[PDB]
Amino acid sequence: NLYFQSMEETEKWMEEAMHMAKEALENTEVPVGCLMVYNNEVVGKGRNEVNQTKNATRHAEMVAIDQVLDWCRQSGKSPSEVFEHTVLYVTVEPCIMCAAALRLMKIPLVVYGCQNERFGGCGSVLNIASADLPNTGRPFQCIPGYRAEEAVEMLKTFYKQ
Amino acid sequence: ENLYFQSMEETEKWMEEAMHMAKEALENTEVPVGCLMVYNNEVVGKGRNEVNQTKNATRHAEMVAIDQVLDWCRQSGKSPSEVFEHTVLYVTVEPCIMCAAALRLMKIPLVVYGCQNERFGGCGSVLNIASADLPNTGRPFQCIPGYRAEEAVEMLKTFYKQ
């Protein structure tokens, strides 16, 4: 019997992701913060660590997935069991790489802020999220736009440097 | 600063090794994809699919290899951008949309691959991320498909009967 996050709890999670975006901005990373909630527990967090780590794959979303995998390791739960019922709260539309990754992990729902004009994979440049692809992952659902103005303002100021 | 370029025979050599790795993947109940990454005439990363062993849907052969190259960098003192930007990837199956997006972001300049990826190919089959006009996200890269495609598709086909 799993627990479903209400609207106010969502706004609350997206608030915490924004604070993480602010932290990333200040560490000279792309301002992207994200959270993964399962059964009313925060099961993965992540900021962009591309500059720190010097590894271009390490977007907020990827850092999160590892934390959740670590979570499963320690709870004894299986990843399929967990990811299939997990909600992602991210500051920016997941890019094509992350969107293709989230399909493969089968996260059903993603709540994001602003559009990813450069490389966004939920409609901006491609819609991998809804792609009719039979034998690869599952499609997922998006609720875009939550505090987009702020998110995009961070993104913009970051792209000057 | 004088970097070494792998020849045709040397490419054929690395693809044979990627083929053996794909065999090992098959026999471990993994999607049969093996790959190598070569920098300045050195094997700087290897990888097979580990999705089942690891139970993480993103650990495609290419992602295993990238982690290994990053590990090689740590120990060689060389920077990731200086290495990946001159690394050739040798793979059994066309990189998927996820991996192709990654390879753009890592800025690997050349992928040599085997058979097509009909379900999730990102070099032309389903989408062509490799050659996409995307100004401020990674670099586009080049592909040499088809090296021993027949055997590569034969392995994949045999694998999809489970």
Ligand SMILES: [Zn+2]
């Ligand atoms: Zn991303």
Ligand SMILES: [Zn+2]
């Ligand atoms: Zn792949």
